[PDB]
Amino acid sequence: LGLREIRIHLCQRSPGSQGVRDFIEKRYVELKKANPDLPILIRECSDVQPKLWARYAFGQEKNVSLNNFSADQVTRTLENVLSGKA
């Protein structure tokens, strides 16, 4: 339940990360305003695939793929991770 940190691994120029890129450049700041104490690490992926990591208490973490998503899709999955809804 207790979220500790989240990581967005997005690849810089691959088309599959394009929507994710849009998120980072449109509505990441607002999100950082809403969660001023939650680590949200933005990291650069290789030529393979974009994905999101979520870490919970006692080191348990899970990842979801973000390939060919849109800005709406990525904010939807991010808010699903943030809330107690899957």
Binding site: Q12, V29, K32, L41
Partner: protein
Amino acid sequence: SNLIEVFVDGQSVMVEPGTTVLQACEKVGMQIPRFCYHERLSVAGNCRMCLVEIEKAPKVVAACAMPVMKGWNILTNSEKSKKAREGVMEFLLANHPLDCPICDQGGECDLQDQSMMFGSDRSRFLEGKRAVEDKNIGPLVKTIMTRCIQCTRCIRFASEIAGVDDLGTTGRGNDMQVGTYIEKMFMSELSGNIIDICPVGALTSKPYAFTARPWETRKTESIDVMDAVGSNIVVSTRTGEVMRILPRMHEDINEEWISDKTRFAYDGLKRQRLTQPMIRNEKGLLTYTTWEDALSRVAGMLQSFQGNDVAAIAGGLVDAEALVALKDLLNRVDSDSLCTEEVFPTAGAGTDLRSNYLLNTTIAGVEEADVILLVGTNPRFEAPLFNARIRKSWLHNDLKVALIGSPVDLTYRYDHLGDSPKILQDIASGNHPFSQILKEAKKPMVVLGSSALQRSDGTAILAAVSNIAQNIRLSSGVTGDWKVMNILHRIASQVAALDLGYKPGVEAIRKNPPKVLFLLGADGGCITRQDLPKDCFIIYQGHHGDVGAPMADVILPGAAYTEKSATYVNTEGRAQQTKVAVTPPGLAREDWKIIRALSEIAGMTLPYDTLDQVRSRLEEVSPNLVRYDDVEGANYFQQANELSKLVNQQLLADPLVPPQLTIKDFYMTDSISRASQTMAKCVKAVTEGI
């Protein structure tokens, strides 16, 4: 095109105008003999070893200074060129001393090799040789001037690369000597490189003297961890012992040079070393122990507490693998108090966006900027190769430099604006004269030292600097991928720790003091036992006995940067990996292996058993830690700038003073250099020249 056609031994080559005969010859794999020419120094033309014949020209020309003409045919192996080489080598060897067995340049001499490949085999010199008295220029460079051939490489290096004009020639004719003419110490943070550029044994390394020969050494290519520049180096070992450190050429990081701390602090790896595990006995004294019992003690103490009661502080020479292993181990206990001694502000973006704490322009990009503003730093001692790059751009590209802070000597003239931080705000405001200067510039750069961020108002300083950069970007527009904003780090372990998610600074531990403290090579003295609850279990894991070890309950001996294959991230974000040159002494072990063994003992076994698996974990946490020469990254300056505006912390009316104010403060910064006996000599020589 603009290329012109020349011929090397009748082979057509297309070269840009201004190319010399030497560069045209090396464009087809032909290396002209040389003694005085260095591709990173100004042309001298005095040694005359490079004389080559041009077809249909009676006079041989100096290939190192002669631009190629259209239609020229260079004859690198004709009778005239060979005879010129033989005559020049004969003159060079006429007065040279018969010192090869006692010379440290023995198997590494350009004079020897070019005599064997281009000179004659006999001597017809039937006179007495000349002898020159030696000069003392300090404890680092040993001088035997009889072996000097007067190529003036050291003089040009000092004058141009180092910005120190202490070396020269006195006299004329045969009795012309290279020196200072006075008893003067040649102190420079890059003074050791004159040992490497000198083709002969006239300048040699004093700590290295008489210990090894070049053919015995095994060469291990590795990365320097003494600063955040990450200079590429070669550790030369012999029979499992480190003999010396040499520069390894990297055109984008350190070029051909290293720092004096990089070169001469390796002996500190033999002085105060942790070799066996230690625990406290019934009398409260540290005593030797097997690995099993110390690991069991630490695991038993770790199993008792959980959450906020367990904290860890990382030191300045900690690798990425050890950092991620400790992060995982403390996460299994549900702890997040993973901190670094170096402080970086966490307001706004903090460490969330990488570009917030990187040198985004990169080191090679310095040679493209037309103006640079330095805030609250001494780049000469914090990052000597970065300062060398700045000096190189100042010399060749006519770079304009300004500094806000203490008026330190940077070896090049700069416009000093003062040391009051308020000036930063004035520049952002536009009231200041310098603000216009940044506006007219096509490629401005602003560099903020991480040492200025260590003070109380570091967040305010970072906010003001970001305001200045944003004003530049808004006024001049986006020039492209220029990345005006930069941060200059001084800790080799800081950037990797920030990438992995470590909390910068120690304030998290001071807010909630822990019951169990992990000191992963933390020898800065930020946290003592006065700032901790009594009966605190302190665990120190490192390779040196320094200020952090005697205050621990359990000591776990770790490996040094020369004893492991470890990943360190640059101040510009470039990940690099060292290689094992020698194994750790005694019972010392690799750090990530120590953490994994401790995890298995304590019951929360980590999912990695080998180095490849722990680097896979590193990729899982931060993918940039496995790209081992990549330096490209994203520009998220807009988001960080927006998030830095929500905090309006007041600046301090305290002048910016860097921790390193003179050369004496440069030599001892970390545990290795404090344990080094050569740096003690350097400090003593700087304090009293005698």
